[PDB]
Design a protein around this ligand. Structure first.
Ligand SMILES: O=C(O)CNC(=O)C(=O)O
Ligand SMILES: [Mg+2]
Ligand code: NI
Ligand SMILES: [Zn+2]
Length: 331
């Protein structure tokens, strides 16, 4: 079995190997990359997502989210308070202000220490889930706006034609902005490209050990667990690496820098934070190997998780028994 310790693998495709997205994902899995839950892909040196970022300040963040924490430093939840719209130019200025800017630090490890020590005492503002793309239309390789759609993959594998579309989303982050422990909707893959700015640190649990993380989460967030049998779908709970180590949960960590892709694999729980002002783009995708994960994916039916139009069909076709109850949650 390849990669039996479930380490995060890093890949350096040639420009030739960068032509066929599906084939390269299948290559990575042949080397065991999926066992980690997360892989890094460094694009060939000849490749670029677009010519410059010089003209992005007029993008609108219509609903910036202030991420308010509750709990203790290593075990907390966050809630998203909606703020007034601002442009990316305004947001970048805010990120760079004395109140919100990255503190002086020695290196990534020192910054990670400061994050876990101090995150809960601040409320950084996150521009999340903004439909759109920063890939130039002329970028032909690994253009997250030109991937084959999950609906087409389901059709190719299973023969069923369904409604729905699949488009990318932009994330504008600042110091301490945080992504809570989650898997993707319907335990899909995700791909994330860090277009610009400061790094993003990731933590990941191997898919084969995901239930260990869930069990811990039920112990650490006991009221949330009683309210919903899939409450990590709410995307609000954080557990530090120290806490994960104290409870024996297998995980890995890696820092993504500007110009790098990360791929999350089905049922790979991940969480992380941004080091300073940055802009990422991400999208879900599927492969044939995903189908069985989609069939087994947990679902939130308490009504909190409230997700896209396109997830309807996935639940309807892959999880017909659940469909009824899940849709009660979504209405
Ligand atoms: O970058 C972020 O804030 C969150 N991204 C992801 O969870 C992802 O790409 O799957
Ligand atoms: Mg602009
Ligand atoms: Ni994700
Ligand atoms: Zn729920």
């Amino acid at each position: 079995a390849q990669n039996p310790n479930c380490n995060i693998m890093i890949f350096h495709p040639t420009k030739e190997e960068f032509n066929d997205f599906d084939k390269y994902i299948a290559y990575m899995e042949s080397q065991g990359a999926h066992r980690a839950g997360l892989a890094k892909i460094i694009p060939p040196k000849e490749w670029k997502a677009r010519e410059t970022y010089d003209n992005i300040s007029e993008i609108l963040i219509a609903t910036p989210l202030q991420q308010v924490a509750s709990g203790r430093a290593g075990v907390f939840t966050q809630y998203h308070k909606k703020k007034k719209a601002m442009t990316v130019g305004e947001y970048r200025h805010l990120a760079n202000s004395k109140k919100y800017q990255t503190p002086p630090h020695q290196n990534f490890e020192d910054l990670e220490r400061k994050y876990w020590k101090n995150r809960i005492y601040n409320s950084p503002i996150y521009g999340a889930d903004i439909s759109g793309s920063l890939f130039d239309e002329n970028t032909k390789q690994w253009n997250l706006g030109h991937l084959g759609t999950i609906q087409d993959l389901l059709e190719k594998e299973c023969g069923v034609v369904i409604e729905g579309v699949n488009t990318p989303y932009l994330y504008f982050g600042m110091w301490k902005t945080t992504f809570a422990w989650h898997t993707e909707d319907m335990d899909l893959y995700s791909i994330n490209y860090l277009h610009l700015g400061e790094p993003k640190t990731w933590y990941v649990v191997p898919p084969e050990h995901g239930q260990r993380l869930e069990r811990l989460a039920r112990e650490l967030f006991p009221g949330s667990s009683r309210g919903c049998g899939a409450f990590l779908r709410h995307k609000v709970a954080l557990i530090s690496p120290t806490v994960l180590k104290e409870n024996g949960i297998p995980f890995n960590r890696i820092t993504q820098e500007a110009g790098e892709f990360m791929v999350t694999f089905p049922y790979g729980y991940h969480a992380g934070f941004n080091h300073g002002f940055n802009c990422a783009e991400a999208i879900n995708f599927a492969t044939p190997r995903w189908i069985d994960y989609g069939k087994m994916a947990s679902q939130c039916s308490c009504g909190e998780a409230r997700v896209t139009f396109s997830m309807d069909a996935f639940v309807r076709i892959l999880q017909p028994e659940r469909y009824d109850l899940w849709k009660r949650g979504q209405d």
